[PDB]
Ligand binder design. Structure first.
Ligand code: SF4
Ligand SMILES: [Zn+2]
Lengths: 143, 66, 431, 107
């Protein structure tokens, strides 16, 4: 159960030296999207409670309301591991926190995090609403 | 005939029915009737007792490379 | 509105795995009606001349201006044709402007110049105009009524003048549960960055139901429609375009899976040039035409989405008025366009259109509840009132390639909120 | 004389092979059709832009915006350059109706 995905993540991350988003880890193991975020949080909590000095880097996502000049906007950001709490304190209302990615050796910008999702989409084209939380009804291939 | 060819030439230059040198004659007659400016019921009654003749059912300068 | 409701629950996602995770359903779109039939052109014969359009514009717009000058200057009326004027006598004239500007290019950045004349023109003759009138706020093609007298040098002295105004507006039924509508414009696929790529990915991931907690997934499930408005492929130089339609087909596939989508042609898009732009041909989209949730429309788009009626363009009239006038605020230019009862008054003189001959279709025959624009450089929204009971919400849609901002319109409270997307860049706060 | 007794043989837009039926593409060059539609609509687009710049220039050289143009001035380049774009557009509009319509029109 737990050792299954724990060993799968430990060979995907530290051995093949890859970059694991939640959508890649849900197209590999055939899992729901929210359960995949929970899986990644489980792995990072276990290996950060075990050792505290791993070769492990995280990136999160923060979403929520804001007011700049009167108006109420809705700001959504993919954030690094240092700057989380300041971004959390700038916001007014908080609406979504989960985990986005983990790494071995630190990147410089948000470059390859689009390459990964794009390439795993490229071969998997007959399903994108397969693991989606919203299942509409009138959209079935007809024409 | 020869009196019906001046009534149409008089309908074609009256400015209160429109600026018409690109279209047919009966299309301009029905365009004015829709807006109902005042089309007269005689420039209709010669475009019905004829077939598709190009010297009744055409604007004055439907030659003329303008 | 939206982000208020998105926090209305409990948060589950910083937790170890569970037995179940919640799912939802897309809200039904149980009423829709396209009523943009005067812009869909089936016959398309050229070989006319542009004089049939001005004549029917004047003939249709004349009784509105007579009926407004009566109740705006008193029923002791002095409305008169331009030839029957006597020297130095008080009268009202209804005509068409023509602005005589040099620096406008002929066949062989603003273009307003410190000297340029206005000329009031009717079907038979013209007259010059001076007095108390704005020289640089007005553009060629507006039809208006005016008050004054013929002076001695043949010119005309103007005291005050009035425009046509808003058309009637029937009221809409109120709604039970709030449904939202998302508006995007100008993705710019073909060039324009890599932060735009992650921005487009995060936008489609939010609306399809892949991102965020049960708050975001409950709130994005209520978004009923998606409208993409023009300028889908921003082009760097024509003489590239073949590889971009593949990626646009993939994106429209990933959106046609969950939501209904409406796609409109823009300034650069593979269609014609004249103003009632016809829909895109389906032979450039192999993948996305599998589903019956994708729809392709034209330039001026009308619709009746859940009782609320929409009308919009991809921002070709507003920038054309911006070229040959002095107004800067795009929301103001949109409202001014509403005030003279014409979607695009500068056509045809500096913005090309088809040569119609039966009826000019850019005159408003009714008043829309929402009226949006296209590729404007910044967000803006406003509410305006009519003389009668007429209220209109005005939105300017931003451009996604620079700002990365879209708009949510509520269909029960009738308000508009911006949404912005920003991944982290090459940012290091220790330098 | 002989020019009236035409047959008007259709031709493939890709490789110029005369054939029976009205479809635009050839059976060997059928796949590459989205690129062949992409090509030539950027030509119709540039003919549309040339029609409008010319036929409204006569309205400003004439004086009036509400009445017909009558000027067959043989020393003006404007005359007979405004005559050929009508036929270019007439021809290029009919070549794209080889392809079907992009939607219905009677709804
Ligand atoms: S054809 Fe040439 S000379 Fe004649 S009105 Fe047109 S622009 Fe002027
Ligand atoms: Zn061929």
């Amino acid at each position: 159960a737990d050792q299954l995905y724990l060993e799968n993540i430990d060979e995907f991350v530290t051995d093949q030296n890859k970059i694991v988003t939640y959508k890649w880890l849900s197209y590999t193991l055939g899992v729901h999207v929210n359960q995949a975020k929970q899986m990644l949080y489980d792995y990072v909590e276990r290996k950060r409670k075990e050792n505290s000095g791993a070769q492990l880097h995280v990136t999160y996502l923060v979403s929520g309301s804001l007011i700049q000049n009167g108006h109420s906007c809705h700001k959504v950001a993919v954030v690094r591991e240092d700057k989380l709490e300041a971004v959390k304190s700038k916001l007014a209302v908080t609406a979504s926190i989960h985990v986005y990615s983990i790494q071995k050796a630190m990147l410089k910008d948000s470059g390859p995090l689009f390459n990964t999702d794009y390439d795993i989409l490229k071969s998997n084209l007959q399903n994108c609403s397969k693991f989606s939380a919203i299942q509409c009804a009138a959209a079935v291939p007809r024409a | 005939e020869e009196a019906e060819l001046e009534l149409l030439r008089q309908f074609d230059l009256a400015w209160q029915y429109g600026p018409c040198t690109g279209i047919t004659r009966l299309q301009r007659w029905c365009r004015a009737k829709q807006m109902g400016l005042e089309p007269p019921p005689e420039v209709w009654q010669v475009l019905k007792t004829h077939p598709g003749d190009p010297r009744f059912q055409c604007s004055l300068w439907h030659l003329y490379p303008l | 509105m939206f982000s208020e409701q998105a926090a209305q629950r409990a948060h589950t996602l910083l937790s170890p795995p569970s037995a179940n995770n919640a799912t939802f359903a897309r809200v039904p779109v149980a009423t829709y009606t396209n009523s943009s039939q005067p812009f869909r052109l089936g016959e398309r014969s050229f070989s006319r001349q542009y004089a049939h359009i001005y004549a029917t514009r004047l003939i249709q717009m004349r009784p509105f201006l007579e009926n407004r000058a009566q109740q705006h200057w008193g029923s002791g009326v002095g409305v008169k044709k331009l030839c029957e004027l006597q020297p130095e006598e008080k009268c009202c004239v209804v005509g068409t402007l023509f602005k005589a500007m040099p620096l406008q290019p002929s066949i062989l950045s603003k273009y307003i110049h410190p000297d340029d004349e206005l000329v009031l023109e009717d079907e038979l003759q013209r007259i010059k105009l001076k007095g108390t009138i704005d020289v640089s706020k007005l553009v060629t093609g507006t039809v208006l009524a005016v008050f004054g007298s013929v002076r001695d040098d043949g010119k005309f002295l103007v005291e005050d003048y009035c425009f046509a105004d808003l058309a009637p507006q029937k009221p809409a039924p109120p709604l039970d549960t709030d449904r939202f509508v998302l508006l995007v414009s100008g993705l710019g696929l073909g060039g324009g960055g890599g932060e735009s790529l992650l921005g487009t990915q995060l936008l489609v991931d939010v609306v399809t139901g892949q991102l965020g907690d049960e708050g975001e997934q409950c709130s994005a499930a209520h978004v009923s429609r998606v409208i993409l408005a023009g300028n889908l492929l921003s082009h760097s130089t024509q003489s590239a375009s073949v590889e971009a339609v593949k990626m646009l087909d993939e994106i429209l596939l990933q959106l046609s899976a969950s939501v209904p989508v409406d796609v409109m042609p823009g300034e650069f898009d593979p269609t014609n040039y004249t103003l009632p732009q016809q829909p895109l041909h389906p032979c450039m989209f192999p993948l996305a035409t599998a589903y019956s949730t994708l729809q392709l429309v034209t330039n001026p788009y009308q619709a009746t989405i859940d009782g609320v009626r929409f009308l919009g363009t991809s921002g070709q009239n507003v920038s054309d008025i911006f070229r040959y006038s002095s107004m800067e605020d795009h929301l103001e230019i949109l409202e001014w366009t509403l005030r003279v009862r014409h979607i695009s008054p500068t056509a045809p003189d500096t913005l090309g259109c088809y040569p119609f001959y039966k009826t000019d279709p850019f005159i408003f025959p009714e008043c829309p509840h929402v009226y949006f624009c296209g590729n404007t450089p910044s967000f803006g929204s406003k509410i305006i009132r009519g003389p009668e009971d007429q209220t209109v919400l005005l939105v300017t849609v931003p451009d996604f390639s620079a700002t990365q901002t879209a708009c949510l319109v509520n269909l029960r409270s009738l308000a508009c909120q911006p949404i912005s997307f920003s991944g982290f860049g090459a940012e290091d706060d220790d330098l | 004389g002989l020019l009236a007794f035409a047959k008007r043989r259709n031709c493939c837009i890709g490789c110029r092979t005369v054939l029976s039926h009205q479809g635009a593409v050839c059976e060997f060059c059928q796949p590459r059709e989205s690129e062949l539609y992409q090509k030539e609509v950027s030509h119709l687009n540039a003919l549309e832009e040339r029609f409008s710049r010319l036929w409204t220039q006569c309205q400003r050289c004439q004086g009036s915006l509400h009445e017909d143009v009558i000027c067959t001035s043989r020393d003006c380049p404007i005359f007979y350059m405004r005559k050929k774009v009508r036929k270019d557009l007439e021809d290029q509009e009919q070549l794209l109706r080889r392809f079907g319509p992009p939607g219905p029109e009677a709804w």
